[PDB]
Design a protein around this ligand. Structure first.
Ligand SMILES: C[S@@+](CC[C@H](N)C(=O)[O-])C[C@H]1O[C@@H](n2cnc3c(N)ncnc32)[C@H](O)[C@@H]1O
Ligand SMILES: [Cl-]
Ligand SMILES: [Zn+2]
Ligand SMILES: [Zn+2]
Lengths: 116, 301
């Protein structure tokens, strides 16, 4: 019945003015990529930065179990594209947002599936 | 010079053939720091330039490639170098990394502990080491060949590097080993490569290209390190981050190099030739299995 809620803890910490987790591993890349959210190689477009995935995962970075029932990580071993305007807090960004299962962009940061 | 647009500078051949005595390393550009692109860590820049240089060599790049990365943790508790290696290497490359201290990593598997505790059932196509102990940088004592993790690395290469495979092992003025230089004579080609972003440091990567499993050349490692320091002492390298801004040709090309299993009796001159050209890897193609020895202690009462 008891399990630590790290996600809520980080959200509350940020809202109370805490400094975002640092040392997320930003990659060099062309910034001419697809802009998809989570990829096997850096895919930032001109509006994004690409980061090593594990370093942007709250559960990886805090040494805690992942929500996935098999403990799998969506980010470890991949690269995550973060909007440049949000690149000051990649952990917060990956935690607060969701990837469109159809086109692979971030909902509300590239996904246009709900516009046709 | 025009070197400033390269990813770094490799030891010129003429320096490799000298017979220098070991001196202190006094770098003219010492203390200077390169201006890194906004938000980019030194170790990302450094690994990127290393990988850019390795793109110019005749690396064997098979399907089901296997790479192991020692010294991969940072004091930040992440693995920037592993992230660059995984970016560089073809998708699906099996990447294992390791360090003394715990860190979070993008590698397919990570072993925490002294490198001498690491064992693998399989052979490897590429070995990267950034292992380093800052306590070696002691200008007040004699600079002798170091053992420690270098002894492990030499044995690991001889036991677990596939024929045709390559290595890049970080050294410095004081962090070096004579047998490792001697082992560079067991590759088709070797160099000491200095990244342009860290050119004010005596750091280099000792690169062995295409392992032959036997001496092509007899190298005295004490003399070779003296030769390396003489080169550094007399050839100031201009700090430069230029190469970081052109990433279009960064990914290592998946050459699909052939992998065969062969017994030492079958390695003839024609095989040795193919190995030397980056055209052949010799090793079993079984599963990749690794382990870390753990010392058990009960210190109760
Ligand atoms: C230059 S740092 C690591 C930098 C890292 N490669 C990166 O990508 O940022 C040197 C590393 O060598 C590791 N190391 C040094 N001696 C070691 C040993 N005997 N066994 C295992 N790791 C060692 C240290 O823990 C340390 O993390
Ligand atoms: Cl020699
Ligand atoms: Zn994770
Ligand atoms: Zn969508």
């Amino acid at each position: 019945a008891f399990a630590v809620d790290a996600a809520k803890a980080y959200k509350d910490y940020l809202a109370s003015g805490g400094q975002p987790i640092t040392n997320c591993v930003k990659m060099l890349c062309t910034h001419t990529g697809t802009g998809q959210a989570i990829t096997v190689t850096p895919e930032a477009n001109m509006d994004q930065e690409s980061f090593g995935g594990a370093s942007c995962c709250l559960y990886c970075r805090c040494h805690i179990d992942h929500p996935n029932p098999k403990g799998f990580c969506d980010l470890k071993g991949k690269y995550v594209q973060i909007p440049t305007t949000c690149a000051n807090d990649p952990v917060g960004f990956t935690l607060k947002n969701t990837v469109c299962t159809v086109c692979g962009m971030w909902k509300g940061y590239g996904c246009s599936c709900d516009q046709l | 010079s025009s070197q400033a647009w390269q990813p770094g500078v490799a030891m010129p051949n003429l320096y490799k053939m000298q017979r220098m005595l070991l001196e202190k390393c006094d770098l003219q550009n010492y203390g200077d720091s390169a201006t890194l692109p906004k938000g980019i860590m030194m170790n990302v820049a450094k690994y990127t330039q290393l990988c850019q240089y390795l793109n110019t060599l005749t690396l064997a790049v098979p399907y089901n490639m296997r790479v192991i990365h020692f010294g991969a943790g940072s004091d930040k508790g992440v693995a920037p170098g592993t992230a660059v290696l995984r970016q560089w290497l073809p998708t699906g490359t099996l990447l294992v990394d390791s360090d003394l201290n715990d860190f979070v990593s993008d590698a397919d598997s990570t072993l925490i502990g002294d490198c001498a505790t690491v064992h693998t059932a399989n052979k490897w196509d590429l070995i990267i080491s950034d292992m380093y102990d800052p306590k070696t940088k002691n200008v007040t004592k004699e600079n002798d060949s170091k053992e420690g993790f270098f002894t492990y690395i030499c044995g690991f290469i001889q036991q677990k590097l596939a024929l045709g495979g390559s290595v890049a092992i970080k050294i410095t003025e004081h962090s070096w080993n004579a047998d490792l230089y001697k082992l560079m004579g067991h590759f088709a080609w070797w160099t000491a490569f200095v990244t342009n972003v860290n050119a004010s440091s005596s750091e280099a990567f000792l690169i062995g290209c295409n392992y032959l499993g036997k001496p092509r050349e007899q190298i005295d490692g004490y003399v070779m390190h003296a030769n390396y320091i003489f080169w550094r002492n007399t050839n100031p390298i201009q700090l430069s981050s230029y190469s970081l801004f052109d990433m279009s040709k960064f990914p290592l090309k998946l050459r699909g190099t052939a992998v065969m299993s062969l017994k030492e009796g079958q390695i003839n001159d024609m095989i040795l030739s193919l190995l030397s050209k980056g055209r052949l890897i010799i090793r079993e193609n079984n599963r990749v299995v690794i382990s870390s020895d753990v010392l058990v202690n009960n210190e109760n009462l």
